[PDB]
Design a protein around this ligand. Structure first.
Ligand SMILES: [Zn+2]
Ligand SMILES: [Zn+2]
Ligand SMILES: [Zn+2]
Ligand SMILES: [Zn+2]
Ligand SMILES: [Zn+2]
Length: 266
């Protein structure tokens, strides 16, 4: 078994599929967690990025990507799985063709506003990510790829998922999508895949209690994210535990995945 996980951001694979990754390595699978939006960003940073860096507990002009890469290595080391950090710049570091920042701040609103941009610019981003994924597939030779469903409709999650779907289709590798966490605790669960792809029936895994514990310890390595993840009530793990409790109310901890298959008549 050669499992390639494709995470949009530094933390998504561990939050959503950490237990499955740790279980996979335990069973003797070769596991690799490649993160798409891990590109090394250079100053000058935008105001919106600077603000994010402060929310992550960093100085505005700190090398934030380096810090987050280090956290990611620690967390994946904890699950006993390998890492690979991609070249793509996260949303807060990207500029548009016209020279504007992709993301700007508004006064008095929590979530950052994304500037409108061309379908061409999205097609091109997704194309480049797909290119990188295809090469990784050639290099690593996965038997299975797992990536995000993009529940919550984060644009970087959709870009990652879509590129993985195009690349895995061309390369004939089976692909599964994980339920995005903690997004799925806050957002419905229905997603729109690119034309020609659809979701098969869900599978909610059964993991040993010790893999649950390892997952949550791995999550704790993302120190920069604890404020963003614990939110208001400081109860991320409670919410994660409660979610898994529902989806197996006669079992313990587990993670929801769906296989991706071709639609009929496509
Ligand atoms: Zn993410
Ligand atoms: Zn490394
Ligand atoms: Zn992003
Ligand atoms: Zn876009
Ligand atoms: Zn769910």
């Amino acid at each position: 078994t050669r499992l390639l996980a494709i995470s949009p951001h530094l933390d998504d694979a561990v939050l959503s599929f950490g237990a499955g990754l740790a279980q996979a390595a335990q069973d003797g699978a070769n596991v690799l967690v490649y993160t798409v939006f891990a590109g090394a960003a250079q100053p000058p940073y935008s105001p919106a990025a600077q603000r994010m860096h402060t929310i992550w507990g960093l100085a505005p002009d700190d090398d934030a990507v380096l810090y987050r890469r280090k956290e990611d290595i620690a967390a994946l080391d904890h699950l006993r799985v390998a890492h690979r950090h991609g070249r793509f710049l996260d949303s807060i570091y990207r500029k548009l063709p016209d020279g504007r920042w992709l993301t700007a701040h508004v006064e008095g609103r929590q979530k950052l506003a994304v500037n409108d941009h061309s379908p061409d610019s999205d097609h091109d981003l997704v194309g480049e990510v797909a290119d990188d994924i295809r090469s990784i597939i050639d290099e690593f030779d996965p038997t299975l790829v797992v990536t995000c469903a993009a529940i919550g409709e984060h644009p970087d999650h959709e870009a990652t998922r879509d590129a993985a779907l195009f690349a895995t289709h061309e390369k004939n590798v089976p692909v599964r999508l994980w339920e995005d966490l903690p997004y799925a605790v806050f957002k419905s669960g229905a997603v729109e895949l690119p034309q020609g792809f659809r979701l098969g029936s869900a599978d909610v895994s059964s993991v040993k209690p010790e893999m649950r514990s390892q997952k949550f310890q791995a999550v704790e390595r993302y120190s920069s994210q604890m404020v963003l993840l614990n939110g208001s009530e400081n109860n991320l793990f409670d919410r994660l535990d409660e979610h898994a409790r529902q989806n197996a109310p006669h079992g313990g901890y587990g993670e929801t995945t769906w296989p991706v298959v071709r639609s009929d008549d496509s």
